[PDB]
Scaffold this motif. Structure first.
Motif, PDB file in Angstrom:
ATOM      1  N   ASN A  91       0.827  -1.195   0.000  1.00 42.82           N
ATOM      2  CA  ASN A  91       0.000   0.000   0.000  1.00 42.82           C
ATOM      3  C   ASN A  91       0.867   1.254   0.000  1.00 42.82           C
ATOM      4  N   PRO A  92       0.293   2.415  -0.336  1.00 43.79           N
ATOM      5  CA  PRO A  92       1.111   3.638  -0.386  1.00 43.79           C
ATOM      6  C   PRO A  92       1.834   3.963   0.914  1.00 43.79           C
ATOM      7  N   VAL A  93       1.292   3.584   2.074  1.00 50.63           N
ATOM      8  CA  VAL A  93       2.043   3.758   3.312  1.00 50.63           C
ATOM      9  C   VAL A  93       3.325   2.965   3.315  1.00 50.63           C
ATOM     10  N   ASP A  94       3.409   1.912   2.509  1.00 60.49           N
ATOM     11  CA  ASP A  94       4.571   1.039   2.534  1.00 60.49           C
ATOM     12  C   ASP A  94       5.615   1.382   1.482  1.00 60.49           C
ATOM     13  N   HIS A  95       5.223   1.853   0.301  1.00 61.69           N
ATOM     14  CA  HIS A  95       6.154   1.809  -0.815  1.00 61.69           C
ATOM     15  C   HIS A  95       5.714   2.803  -1.878  1.00 61.69           C
ATOM     16  N   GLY A 141      -0.278   0.484  -3.938  1.00 64.37           N
ATOM     17  CA  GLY A 141      -1.611   1.013  -4.143  1.00 64.37           C
ATOM     18  C   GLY A 141      -2.117   0.774  -5.555  1.00 64.37           C
ATOM     19  N   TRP A 176      12.451   3.445  -0.150  1.00 61.52           N
ATOM     20  CA  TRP A 176      12.828   4.691   0.493  1.00 61.52           C
ATOM     21  C   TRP A 176      12.745   5.882  -0.455  1.00 61.52           C
TER      22      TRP A 176
END
Ligand SMILES: [K+]
Ligand SMILES: [Mg+2]
Ligand SMILES: [Mg+2]
Ligand SMILES: [Mg+2]
Ligand SMILES: [Mg+2]
Ligand SMILES: [Mg+2]
Ligand SMILES: [Mg+2]
Ligand SMILES: [Mg+2]
Ligand SMILES: [Mg+2]
Ligand SMILES: [Mg+2]
Ligand SMILES: [Mg+2]
Ligand SMILES: [Mg+2]
Ligand SMILES: [Mg+2]
Ligand SMILES: [Mg+2]
Ligand SMILES: [Mg+2]
Ligand SMILES: [Mg+2]
Ligand SMILES: [Mg+2]
Ligand SMILES: [Mg+2]
Ligand SMILES: [Mg+2]
Ligand SMILES: [Mg+2]
Ligand SMILES: [Mg+2]
Ligand SMILES: [Mg+2]
Ligand SMILES: [Mg+2]
Ligand SMILES: [Mg+2]
Ligand SMILES: [Mg+2]
Ligand SMILES: [Mg+2]
Ligand SMILES: [Mg+2]
Ligand SMILES: [Mg+2]
Ligand SMILES: [Mg+2]
Ligand SMILES: [Mg+2]
Ligand SMILES: [Mg+2]
Ligand SMILES: [Mg+2]
Ligand SMILES: [Mg+2]
Ligand SMILES: [Mg+2]
Ligand SMILES: [Mg+2]
Ligand SMILES: [Mg+2]
Ligand SMILES: [Mg+2]
Ligand SMILES: [Mg+2]
Ligand SMILES: [Mg+2]
Ligand SMILES: [Mg+2]
Ligand SMILES: [Mg+2]
Ligand SMILES: [Mg+2]
Ligand SMILES: [Mg+2]
Ligand SMILES: [Mg+2]
Ligand SMILES: [Mg+2]
Ligand SMILES: [Mg+2]
Ligand SMILES: [Mg+2]
Ligand SMILES: [Mg+2]
Ligand SMILES: [Mg+2]
Ligand SMILES: [Mg+2]
Ligand SMILES: [Mg+2]
Ligand SMILES: [Mg+2]
Ligand SMILES: [Mg+2]
Ligand SMILES: [Mg+2]
Ligand SMILES: [Mg+2]
Ligand SMILES: [Mg+2]
Ligand SMILES: [Mg+2]
Ligand SMILES: [Mg+2]
Ligand SMILES: [Mg+2]
Ligand SMILES: [Mg+2]
Ligand SMILES: [Mg+2]
Ligand SMILES: [Mg+2]
Ligand SMILES: [Mg+2]
Ligand SMILES: [Mg+2]
Ligand SMILES: [Mg+2]
Ligand SMILES: [Mg+2]
Ligand SMILES: [Mg+2]
Ligand SMILES: [Mg+2]
Ligand SMILES: [Mg+2]
Ligand SMILES: [Mg+2]
Ligand SMILES: [Mg+2]
Ligand SMILES: [Mg+2]
Ligand SMILES: [Mg+2]
Ligand SMILES: [Mg+2]
Ligand SMILES: [Mg+2]
Ligand SMILES: [Mg+2]
Ligand SMILES: [Mg+2]
Ligand SMILES: [Mg+2]
Ligand SMILES: [Mg+2]
Ligand SMILES: [Mg+2]
Ligand SMILES: [Mg+2]
Ligand SMILES: [Mg+2]
Ligand SMILES: [Mg+2]
Ligand SMILES: [Mg+2]
Ligand SMILES: [Mg+2]
Ligand SMILES: [Mg+2]
Ligand SMILES: [Mg+2]
Ligand SMILES: [Mg+2]
Ligand SMILES: [Mg+2]
Ligand SMILES: [Mg+2]
Ligand SMILES: [Mg+2]
Ligand SMILES: [Mg+2]
Ligand SMILES: [Mg+2]
Ligand SMILES: [Mg+2]
Ligand SMILES: [Mg+2]
Ligand SMILES: [Mg+2]
Ligand SMILES: [Mg+2]
Ligand SMILES: [Mg+2]
Ligand SMILES: [Mg+2]
Ligand SMILES: [Mg+2]
Ligand SMILES: [Mg+2]
Ligand SMILES: [Mg+2]
Ligand SMILES: [Mg+2]
Ligand SMILES: [Mg+2]
Ligand SMILES: [Mg+2]
Ligand SMILES: [Mg+2]
Ligand SMILES: [Mg+2]
Ligand SMILES: [Mg+2]
Ligand SMILES: [Mg+2]
Ligand SMILES: [Mg+2]
Ligand SMILES: [Mg+2]
Ligand SMILES: [Mg+2]
Ligand SMILES: [Mg+2]
Ligand SMILES: [Mg+2]
Ligand SMILES: [Mg+2]
Ligand SMILES: [Mg+2]
Ligand SMILES: [Mg+2]
Ligand SMILES: [Mg+2]
Ligand SMILES: [Mg+2]
Ligand SMILES: [Mg+2]
Ligand SMILES: [Mg+2]
Ligand SMILES: [Mg+2]
Ligand SMILES: [Mg+2]
Ligand SMILES: [Mg+2]
Ligand SMILES: [Mg+2]
Ligand SMILES: [Mg+2]
Ligand SMILES: [Mg+2]
Ligand SMILES: [Mg+2]
Ligand SMILES: [Mg+2]
Ligand SMILES: [Mg+2]
Ligand SMILES: [Mg+2]
Ligand SMILES: [Mg+2]
Ligand SMILES: [Mg+2]
Ligand SMILES: [Mg+2]
Ligand SMILES: [Mg+2]
Ligand SMILES: [Mg+2]
Ligand SMILES: [Mg+2]
Ligand SMILES: [Mg+2]
Ligand SMILES: [Mg+2]
Ligand SMILES: [Mg+2]
Ligand SMILES: [Mg+2]
Ligand SMILES: [Mg+2]
Ligand SMILES: [Mg+2]
Ligand SMILES: [Mg+2]
Ligand SMILES: [Mg+2]
Ligand SMILES: [Mg+2]
Ligand SMILES: [Mg+2]
Ligand SMILES: [Mg+2]
Ligand SMILES: [Mg+2]
Ligand SMILES: [Mg+2]
Ligand SMILES: [Mg+2]
Ligand SMILES: [Mg+2]
Ligand SMILES: [Mg+2]
Ligand SMILES: [Mg+2]
Ligand SMILES: [Mg+2]
Ligand SMILES: [Mg+2]
Ligand SMILES: [Mg+2]
Ligand SMILES: [Mg+2]
Ligand SMILES: [Mg+2]
Ligand SMILES: [Mg+2]
Ligand SMILES: [Mg+2]
Ligand SMILES: [Mg+2]
Ligand SMILES: [Mg+2]
Ligand SMILES: [Mg+2]
Ligand SMILES: [Mg+2]
Ligand SMILES: [Mg+2]
Ligand SMILES: [Mg+2]
Ligand SMILES: [Mg+2]
Ligand SMILES: [Mg+2]
Ligand SMILES: [Mg+2]
Ligand SMILES: [Mg+2]
Ligand SMILES: [Mg+2]
Ligand SMILES: [Mg+2]
Ligand SMILES: [Mg+2]
Ligand SMILES: [Mg+2]
Ligand SMILES: [Mg+2]
Ligand SMILES: [Mg+2]
Ligand SMILES: [Mg+2]
Ligand SMILES: [Mg+2]
Ligand SMILES: [Mg+2]
Ligand SMILES: [Mg+2]
Ligand SMILES: [Mg+2]
Ligand SMILES: [Mg+2]
Ligand SMILES: [Mg+2]
Ligand SMILES: [Mg+2]
Ligand SMILES: [Mg+2]
Ligand SMILES: [Mg+2]
Ligand SMILES: [Mg+2]
Ligand SMILES: [Mg+2]
Ligand SMILES: [Mg+2]
Ligand SMILES: [Mg+2]
Ligand SMILES: [Mg+2]
Ligand SMILES: [Mg+2]
Ligand SMILES: [Mg+2]
Ligand SMILES: [Mg+2]
Ligand SMILES: [Mg+2]
Ligand SMILES: [Mg+2]
Ligand SMILES: [Mg+2]
Ligand SMILES: [Mg+2]
Ligand SMILES: [Mg+2]
Ligand SMILES: [Mg+2]
Ligand SMILES: [Mg+2]
Ligand SMILES: [Mg+2]
Ligand SMILES: [Mg+2]
Ligand SMILES: [Mg+2]
Ligand SMILES: [Mg+2]
Ligand SMILES: [Mg+2]
Ligand SMILES: [Mg+2]
Ligand SMILES: [Mg+2]
Ligand SMILES: [Mg+2]
Ligand SMILES: [Mg+2]
Ligand SMILES: [Mg+2]
Ligand SMILES: [Mg+2]
Ligand SMILES: [Mg+2]
Ligand SMILES: [Mg+2]
Ligand SMILES: [Mg+2]
Ligand SMILES: [Mg+2]
Ligand SMILES: [Mg+2]
Ligand SMILES: [Mg+2]
Ligand SMILES: [Mg+2]
Ligand SMILES: [Mg+2]
Ligand SMILES: [Mg+2]
Ligand SMILES: [Mg+2]
Ligand SMILES: [Mg+2]
Ligand SMILES: [Mg+2]
Ligand SMILES: [Mg+2]
Ligand SMILES: [Mg+2]
Ligand SMILES: [Mg+2]
Ligand SMILES: [Mg+2]
Ligand SMILES: [Mg+2]
Ligand SMILES: [Mg+2]
Ligand SMILES: [Mg+2]
Ligand SMILES: [Mg+2]
Ligand SMILES: [Mg+2]
Ligand SMILES: [Mg+2]
Ligand SMILES: [Mg+2]
Ligand SMILES: [Mg+2]
Ligand SMILES: [Mg+2]
Ligand SMILES: [Mg+2]
Ligand SMILES: [Mg+2]
Ligand SMILES: [Mg+2]
Ligand SMILES: [Mg+2]
Ligand SMILES: [Mg+2]
Ligand SMILES: [Mg+2]
Ligand SMILES: [Mg+2]
Ligand SMILES: [Mg+2]
Ligand SMILES: [Mg+2]
Ligand SMILES: [Mg+2]
Ligand SMILES: [Mg+2]
Ligand SMILES: [Mg+2]
Ligand SMILES: [Mg+2]
Ligand SMILES: [Mg+2]
Ligand SMILES: [Mg+2]
Ligand SMILES: [Mg+2]
Ligand SMILES: [Mg+2]
Ligand SMILES: [Mg+2]
Ligand SMILES: [Mg+2]
Ligand SMILES: [Mg+2]
Ligand SMILES: [Mg+2]
Ligand SMILES: [Mg+2]
Ligand SMILES: [Mg+2]
Ligand SMILES: [Mg+2]
Ligand SMILES: [Mg+2]
Ligand SMILES: [Mg+2]
Ligand SMILES: [Mg+2]
Lengths: 275, 48
Positions: free
Chosen positions: A226-230, A234, A249
């Motif tokens: 998901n966008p919080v991750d990478h 998403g 990162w």
RNA sequence: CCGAGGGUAGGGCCCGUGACUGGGGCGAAGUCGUAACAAGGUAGCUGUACCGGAAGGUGCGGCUGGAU
RNA sequence: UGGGAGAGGGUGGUGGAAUUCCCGGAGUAGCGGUGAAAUGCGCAGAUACCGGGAGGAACGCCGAUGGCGAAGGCAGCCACCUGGUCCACCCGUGACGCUGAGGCGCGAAAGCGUGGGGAGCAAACCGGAUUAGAUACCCGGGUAGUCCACGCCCUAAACG
RNA sequence: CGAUGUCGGCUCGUCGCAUCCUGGGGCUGAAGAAGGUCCCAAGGGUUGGGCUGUUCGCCCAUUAAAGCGGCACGCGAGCUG
RNA sequence: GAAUGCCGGCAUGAGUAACGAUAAAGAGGGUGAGAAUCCCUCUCGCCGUAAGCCCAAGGGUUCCUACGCAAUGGUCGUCAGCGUAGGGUUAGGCGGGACCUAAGGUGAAGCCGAAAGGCGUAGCCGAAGGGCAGCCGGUUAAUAUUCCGGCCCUUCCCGCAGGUGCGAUGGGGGGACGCUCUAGGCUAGGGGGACCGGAGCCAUGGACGAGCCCGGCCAGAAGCGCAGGGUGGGAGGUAGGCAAAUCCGCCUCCCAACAAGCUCUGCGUGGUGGGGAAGCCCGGGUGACAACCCCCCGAAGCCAGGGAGCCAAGAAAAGCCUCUAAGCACAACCUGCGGGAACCCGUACCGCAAACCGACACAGGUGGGCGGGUGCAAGAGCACUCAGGCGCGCGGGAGAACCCUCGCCAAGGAACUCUGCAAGUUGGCCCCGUAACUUCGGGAGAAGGGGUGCUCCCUGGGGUGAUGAGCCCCGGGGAGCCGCAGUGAACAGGCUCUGGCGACUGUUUACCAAAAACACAGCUCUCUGCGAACUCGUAAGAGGAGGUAUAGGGAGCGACGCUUGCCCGGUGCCGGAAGGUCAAGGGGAGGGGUGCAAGCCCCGAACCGAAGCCCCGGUGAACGGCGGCCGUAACUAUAACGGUCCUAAGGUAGCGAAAUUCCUUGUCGGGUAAGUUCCGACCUGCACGAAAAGCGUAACGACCGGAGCGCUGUCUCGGCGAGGGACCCGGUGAAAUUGAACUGGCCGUGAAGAUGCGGCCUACCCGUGGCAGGACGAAAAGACCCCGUGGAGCUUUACUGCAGCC
RNA sequence: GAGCUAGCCCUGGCCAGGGUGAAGCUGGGGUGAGACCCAGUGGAGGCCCGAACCGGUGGGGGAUGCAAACCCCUCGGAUGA
């Protein structure tokens, strides 16, 4: 010569293993092993700093002699070639006339029973270690110190070698395993010959369990997150990158050079790597 | 099913005990405050 | 007991037929281009490979059944 | 038994020419290319010249209407390993021969698999020309491939 | 909007009549038989299956007939989902 | 008087739901004011890889006994894990500590950080790992490897004797190791005996018997026996094991080598000490001078640090042995024996549960060991049973609807329905037999079938033993018996064909999604020369890695097969010592303020001046993108072909009404009586297409389509039956909800759906079992929707910053 | 606050029984030598069936529950990621 298997499970259909035929001793020299502290990829903070590590087979570390200039002129007998789980190369057990026993990494062609030796006057023979200035231009060589007396650093993996290409003042020119052309100081020791077990690269792990046995835990694509991750996470359904391919990162990961520009050793790299 | 309280005397003393509190600025404030508040026990009871 | 045969199930071979599809033969005066026969206007042919509306083109190696 | 000629085969090594690229030098207004040109390269200093180096592939003259191999095929040089073959002598065996459905092995190029290698060349492809068009011929690029090892493929105007 | 659960199906009905069938009629380009068309009539009746979540529709086999609508597109403190 | 207000009290629902597994009760006799519920007895049922027993954790007196019954106990209570009191836990050998080290934690040295604090070698801490000396029985109401008894043992201190270069936190050896498979020999455990011991028994037709029933051992020091583990011996050299070293390592030589020797365990035996059934009688006494023997099966445990194979290559430190150094050789150490010394903490009891975790004596959860017998091919499966433990802390009746779990069903057989959902069917073993396709393994238990009990006879091999008997194991043939039926009960696949997706075994939304999603071997691009890149951290320091390009990071794709075309104009990234711009800074033309002036002070042009940007190139398994209109063939139709406009280039191969097709149920074919689904085709693809991969693919799937066979209560179409409830009686007794209520129908009216208003109609008062149409019934201040200059997550070429990097 | 849960580190423990039968080894055949074939031996594997154990597929019950995720039947894995 990698060993195939008959397809009597779905995973054995492609699985290949090393032949281990160069191996003559099958339990390590007790006085040369010590426990390898498994990290899981976690630094001294407990934090994962290299993702997807952990849970591989237990290993003891074989202490390897990457100096070899502690015992100049003292010849050794090659007593055994052993399996080392901490590296791709095979290791060779050496019995010095001292009585002292040491591991070096097994160059290709080294035979149990032969003698090796280290020093400025050593013959140019597979197994022997000299400072670079005394090894004739053209010689294929491995376990190369990168700075005098700092320890063998380059060309240590199975099958790798550096070639001496020329000389220039106190330095010699090496073609490193990667293709890079680099000056290395003449006093730096190297060992004549290529690293052995060159068939290593042709091993086919065959199944996910094999990666797990090596301490490799599953790698999750950023596009699966998901966008919080990478950056790639998403999107409804599947999704192309939709931006320059990036790491977890944020930094770009197709082409972006990452060697620090003003690095003092740049004065010594002649030509960046190939292929 | 498996509930969340799984008592363990060593875990209780090592996590919340007197000596864990005194080894840390926050825990020493926990002790400071429970004294000021006049608590009868500054620290969880565990039989050891 | 064997036993015509009947029944259950599974195979093999052949014949017919089938939306659709593949090329093939043939058919007085259709369309496109001109690959071959002259050095046929890039000598041709060739096995293979790749490409192109089409004949063909190109690479590699071979043949003279090539001219001057 | 004694001798011979030979690019016959396999392995290891090794020499000089040339190309390309790189580094230094020196030099400046074009080079390149064609039928002619254009694309392309070049003042960010190309071409032409000298020096140094890296790397791959092919071995000029000798060289031939030549030689060897059963064929495909085989050409710098050195060593090792190995085959076929001719001549001499007339010594030995005493028809032990010829061919050969099957089988087995070899088998140019191209192609395929796993690695390595990649200078030049070059299918595909891109561009510039030519043309009515030009998916061609010509020109500038250029990837497989061409080279090594192992394993497949088993084709041919594999022809005398 | 300090909540009126929202399609269809199942069950269970009940009603309207602009009537699908059965009953009674007039006109017919109603010979007869079968129809057409309008009038009266809601007592009862109005099938089983294939397809689709489907309502609807189309199809198969029947039928005297395979009627159309209302009831919070009747019915989730009855079920399904 | 209202705030779904706050606190408290008390109502309503209501004598209503419920009383917590459907393993189950009945009677007699006790006790007591009181008894379905407490005690005793007999009968009955349930568990028995537990629902029994022993550890650990957790709990913390719940343990035993006497006296109690207000509350607690879902009823009762005389009972109790309850109330009151008294009593109860005994160790040199069990566990832990006075031993060792693991991760980790801590941390003299040292390093870093505004402070707090973060690191960090050694060292120290740290255990369910290493190490270490106790077994059998007896006894208490309650502890016992702890007390007692018998037989064993350890350490320390001192002594005596013998022996020796004694001596260490230092050197060395050893400790010291994986997974799978496994030999020999034992033991634990179990079966049988016509043998030995035993109170008795003869029933109801038979049996006085080679009858029934019961038991037939446990521990044990030295010695010996058996089975195993460990281990060469001597000498010479010696520069290595951070001093030394006779040790160890290395070289050489000699003798030994499946051995032997020495040593250490296991097991057997063993002076000796124990135990010792049924039954009978009252936990005990008898039995009993109890007997205590033989055969067989036999571990996953023991010998053990055993053996073989394999790749993913398998802790440390102490104890212990050896070596020597300071030292000391009057010491000291080793050995044997003797006397003395031996501390601290735990020890009750529950412990798959009423005592632990779940608010409850809660159908949930909880790690290790033992877990007997017979039969079922095996087994910890399944049925029944032993030892042992239970009947689940409300009962008694009744035999309605309806609900639950269950059994059967005439004819039909999927007609049910979104769907064969559910339920049938099938079902173990043996033998026969088995297709497309395939990656040659597989598909495969394919499919489909035949056998299966019992009796008698003949007969083959193996283990034990002796080569035999017996016991035990694996079979072959022949002749028969019975029933509806022989894996006779219990446990134990329905099958096939054909599509989509995903290769595969795995993984996931703890608690509505298990999947086609994630992962996965494998393919590619890319970064990274090592004080790597990258990651966490202000830093020091870590990870990466004690690794080194056959390695490490990042990204996409996702086994395998055949493949992956064209576009670099834009964005990204890569390359480019030129040019353009470019900040601080350099420079100081030229000014300005001030001062009598020397001066002091402020501004300031050209020019020099980095990264970045511009600019020039490269680059697609980087971000991405891959055209339009008109015309044309001798039937028509259609266009291989042409014209022109545009593009950076106009989508190649393959595939296509698709997990994508809008029009759509496209059209045609197949399957069906009938097919909006399915399959195969066609191609005007609204809006496939090549590593967000394209097209395939054997095997695999609790994935999702479609079809068939088999079989069925799914259905036509329901019937009956069982038990647990519902129902009635005794005992205990909630809940949401609730403005108050004396709370009907229609047609109207009303804020537009009226018990409550109007008119009419109907209606005696109050309940019980039922049904759900209404009370716009309950629940939850609508999640949808909008509104708020309300919030939060996320994105980016929105703004503006910051870390980071240049 | 990681006594729940997720990951990792250290140290231990557990996985009845049955089936399939890879490599290798041995022998036989084969050849110039070979590859190779055959039989026996062998005991491989994210192999197969199935308990413990770990799961949570479908359906039913439960829904002021026995339970703030449970029960029954059925089903996945069960030497391995
Ligand atoms: K919405
Ligand atoms: Mg293989
Ligand atoms: Mg194979
Ligand atoms: Mg090897
Ligand atoms: Mg060690
Ligand atoms: Mg480490
Ligand atoms: Mg640490
Ligand atoms: Mg990382
Ligand atoms: Mg990690
Ligand atoms: Mg190795
Ligand atoms: Mg490595
Ligand atoms: Mg250097
Ligand atoms: Mg390897
Ligand atoms: Mg590789
Ligand atoms: Mg590993
Ligand atoms: Mg990986
Ligand atoms: Mg992944
Ligand atoms: Mg995602
Ligand atoms: Mg997601
Ligand atoms: Mg987060
Ligand atoms: Mg963010
Ligand atoms: Mg982001
Ligand atoms: Mg995205
Ligand atoms: Mg997504
Ligand atoms: Mg999408
Ligand atoms: Mg997604
Ligand atoms: Mg997509
Ligand atoms: Mg995009
Ligand atoms: Mg990006
Ligand atoms: Mg960075
Ligand atoms: Mg480089
Ligand atoms: Mg849990
Ligand atoms: Mg559990
Ligand atoms: Mg716990
Ligand atoms: Mg504890
Ligand atoms: Mg503990
Ligand atoms: Mg703990
Ligand atoms: Mg802590
Ligand atoms: Mg503490
Ligand atoms: Mg403080
Ligand atoms: Mg303070
Ligand atoms: Mg308190
Ligand atoms: Mg007090
Ligand atoms: Mg506290
Ligand atoms: Mg031509
Ligand atoms: Mg022509
Ligand atoms: Mg021509
Ligand atoms: Mg061409
Ligand atoms: Mg120019
Ligand atoms: Mg210039
Ligand atoms: Mg090169
Ligand atoms: Mg003669
Ligand atoms: Mg003769
Ligand atoms: Mg060939
Ligand atoms: Mg052009
Ligand atoms: Mg023209
Ligand atoms: Mg090339
Ligand atoms: Mg010829
Ligand atoms: Mg509303
Ligand atoms: Mg309300
Ligand atoms: Mg509503
Ligand atoms: Mg409400
Ligand atoms: Mg129905
Ligand atoms: Mg009529
Ligand atoms: Mg009617
Ligand atoms: Mg009607
Ligand atoms: Mg319909
Ligand atoms: Mg409707
Ligand atoms: Mg319709
Ligand atoms: Mg209607
Ligand atoms: Mg109406
Ligand atoms: Mg409507
Ligand atoms: Mg409507
Ligand atoms: Mg409705
Ligand atoms: Mg409705
Ligand atoms: Mg409902
Ligand atoms: Mg409904
Ligand atoms: Mg309702
Ligand atoms: Mg309602
Ligand atoms: Mg008021
Ligand atoms: Mg109030
Ligand atoms: Mg309020
Ligand atoms: Mg209140
Ligand atoms: Mg009060
Ligand atoms: Mg109150
Ligand atoms: Mg009250
Ligand atoms: Mg009242
Ligand atoms: Mg009341
Ligand atoms: Mg009452
Ligand atoms: Mg009521
Ligand atoms: Mg209730
Ligand atoms: Mg209840
Ligand atoms: Mg209750
Ligand atoms: Mg039950
Ligand atoms: Mg009862
Ligand atoms: Mg009774
Ligand atoms: Mg009672
Ligand atoms: Mg009573
Ligand atoms: Mg009793
Ligand atoms: Mg009785
Ligand atoms: Mg049993
Ligand atoms: Mg408690
Ligand atoms: Mg009481
Ligand atoms: Mg009383
Ligand atoms: Mg009472
Ligand atoms: Mg009292
Ligand atoms: Mg009570
Ligand atoms: Mg209770
Ligand atoms: Mg009493
Ligand atoms: Mg009390
Ligand atoms: Mg007690
Ligand atoms: Mg004692
Ligand atoms: Mg102790
Ligand atoms: Mg002391
Ligand atoms: Mg500690
Ligand atoms: Mg300790
Ligand atoms: Mg311990
Ligand atoms: Mg003992
Ligand atoms: Mg007493
Ligand atoms: Mg000594
Ligand atoms: Mg060891
Ligand atoms: Mg070890
Ligand atoms: Mg261990
Ligand atoms: Mg293994
Ligand atoms: Mg014994
Ligand atoms: Mg037995
Ligand atoms: Mg010495
Ligand atoms: Mg032992
Ligand atoms: Mg007596
Ligand atoms: Mg075991
Ligand atoms: Mg052992
Ligand atoms: Mg062993
Ligand atoms: Mg250590
Ligand atoms: Mg001295
Ligand atoms: Mg003295
Ligand atoms: Mg001694
Ligand atoms: Mg003490
Ligand atoms: Mg004590
Ligand atoms: Mg005790
Ligand atoms: Mg349980
Ligand atoms: Mg247990
Ligand atoms: Mg209890
Ligand atoms: Mg709780
Ligand atoms: Mg409570
Ligand atoms: Mg109870
Ligand atoms: Mg319980
Ligand atoms: Mg027994
Ligand atoms: Mg069985
Ligand atoms: Mg009961
Ligand atoms: Mg029970
Ligand atoms: Mg009744
Ligand atoms: Mg039941
Ligand atoms: Mg039955
Ligand atoms: Mg019957
Ligand atoms: Mg029936
Ligand atoms: Mg049927
Ligand atoms: Mg049937
Ligand atoms: Mg059907
Ligand atoms: Mg469904
Ligand atoms: Mg069965
Ligand atoms: Mg078939
Ligand atoms: Mg077959
Ligand atoms: Mg098939
Ligand atoms: Mg197939
Ligand atoms: Mg096959
Ligand atoms: Mg069968
Ligand atoms: Mg039979
Ligand atoms: Mg019988
Ligand atoms: Mg009979
Ligand atoms: Mg089955
Ligand atoms: Mg999936
Ligand atoms: Mg899958
Ligand atoms: Mg796929
Ligand atoms: Mg696949
Ligand atoms: Mg895959
Ligand atoms: Mg599995
Ligand atoms: Mg979920
Ligand atoms: Mg959820
Ligand atoms: Mg959620
Ligand atoms: Mg949840
Ligand atoms: Mg669910
Ligand atoms: Mg699944
Ligand atoms: Mg997932
Ligand atoms: Mg996969
Ligand atoms: Mg791949
Ligand atoms: Mg690669
Ligand atoms: Mg950071
Ligand atoms: Mg700071
Ligand atoms: Mg490290
Ligand atoms: Mg790598
Ligand atoms: Mg994936
Ligand atoms: Mg993917
Ligand atoms: Mg572009
Ligand atoms: Mg460009
Ligand atoms: Mg670009
Ligand atoms: Mg786009
Ligand atoms: Mg674009
Ligand atoms: Mg193509
Ligand atoms: Mg289509
Ligand atoms: Mg499709
Ligand atoms: Mg779709
Ligand atoms: Mg589409
Ligand atoms: Mg459509
Ligand atoms: Mg449609
Ligand atoms: Mg249609
Ligand atoms: Mg049809
Ligand atoms: Mg069409
Ligand atoms: Mg498209
Ligand atoms: Mg993409
Ligand atoms: Mg497939
Ligand atoms: Mg294929
Ligand atoms: Mg397939
Ligand atoms: Mg699956
Ligand atoms: Mg599945
Ligand atoms: Mg069907
Ligand atoms: Mg059918
Ligand atoms: Mg029924
Ligand atoms: Mg009943
Ligand atoms: Mg009554
Ligand atoms: Mg009462
Ligand atoms: Mg009560
Ligand atoms: Mg009122
Ligand atoms: Mg009133
Ligand atoms: Mg009323
Ligand atoms: Mg009324
Ligand atoms: Mg109105
Ligand atoms: Mg009204
Ligand atoms: Mg009224
Ligand atoms: Mg009134
Ligand atoms: Mg009024
Ligand atoms: Mg009124
Ligand atoms: Mg009125
Ligand atoms: Mg009325
Ligand atoms: Mg009543
Ligand atoms: Mg009632
Ligand atoms: Mg109602
Ligand atoms: Mg209702
Ligand atoms: Mg009801
Ligand atoms: Mg309302
Ligand atoms: Mg209502
Ligand atoms: Mg309502
Ligand atoms: Mg609610
Ligand atoms: Mg509110
Ligand atoms: Mg609201
Ligand atoms: Mg709300
Ligand atoms: Mg929402
Ligand atoms: Mg709105
Ligand atoms: Mg605004
Ligand atoms: Mg406003
Ligand atoms: Mg806002
Ligand atoms: Mg297992
Ligand atoms: Mg076998
Ligand atoms: Mg073997
Ligand atoms: Mg398995
Ligand atoms: Mg099986
Ligand atoms: Mg469930
Ligand atoms: Mg679970
Ligand atoms: Mg079911
Ligand atoms: Mg309920
Ligand atoms: Mg619930
Ligand atoms: Mg359950
Ligand atoms: Mg079950
Ligand atoms: Mg199952
Ligand atoms: Mg298993
Ligand atoms: Mg299984």
């Amino acid at each position: 010569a990698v060993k195939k298997f008959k397809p009597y499970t779905p995973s054995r259909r492609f699985m290949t293993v090393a032949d281990f035929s160069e191996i003559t001793k099958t339990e390590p020299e007790k006085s040369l092993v010590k426990p390898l502290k498994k990290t899981g990829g976690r630094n001294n903070q407990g934090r994962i700093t290299v993702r997807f590590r952990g849970g591989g087979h237990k290993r003891l570390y074989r202490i390897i002699d990457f100096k070899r200039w502690d015992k100049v002129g003292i010849p050794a007998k090659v007593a055994a070639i052993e399996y080392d789980p901490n590296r791709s190369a095979r290791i060779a057990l050496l019995h010095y006339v001292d009585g002292e026993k040491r591991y070096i990494i097994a160059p290709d062609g080294l035979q149990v029973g032969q003698q090796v030796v280290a020093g400025p006057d050593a013959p140019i023979q597979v197994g022997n270690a000299l400072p670079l200035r005394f090894i004739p231009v053209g010689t294929v060589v491995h376990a190369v110190e990168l700075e005098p007396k700092k320890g063998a650093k380059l060309a240590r993996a199975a099958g790798t070698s550096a070639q001496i290409q020329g000389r220039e003042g106190d330095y010699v020119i090496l073609r490193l395993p990667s293709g890079e052309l680099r000056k290395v100081h003449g006093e730096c020791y190297a060992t004549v010959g290529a690293v052995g077990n060159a068939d290593h690269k042709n091993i086919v792990l065959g199944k996910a369990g094999r990666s797990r046995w090596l301490g490799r835990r599953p790698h999750v694509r950023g596009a699966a997150m998901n966008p919080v991750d990478h950056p790639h996470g998403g999107g409804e359904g599947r999704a192309p990158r939709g931006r320059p391919p990036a790491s977890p990162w944020g930094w770009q990961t197709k082409g972006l050079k990452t060697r620090k520009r003003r690095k003092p050793s740049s004065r010594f790299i002649i030509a960046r790597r190939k292929k | 099913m498996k509930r969340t309280w799984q008592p363990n005397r060593r875990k209780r003393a090592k996590t919340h005990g007197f000596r864990a509190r005194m080894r840390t600025p926050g825990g020493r404030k926990v002790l400071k405050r429970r004294r000021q508040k006049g608590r009868w026990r500054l620290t969880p009871a565990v039989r050891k």
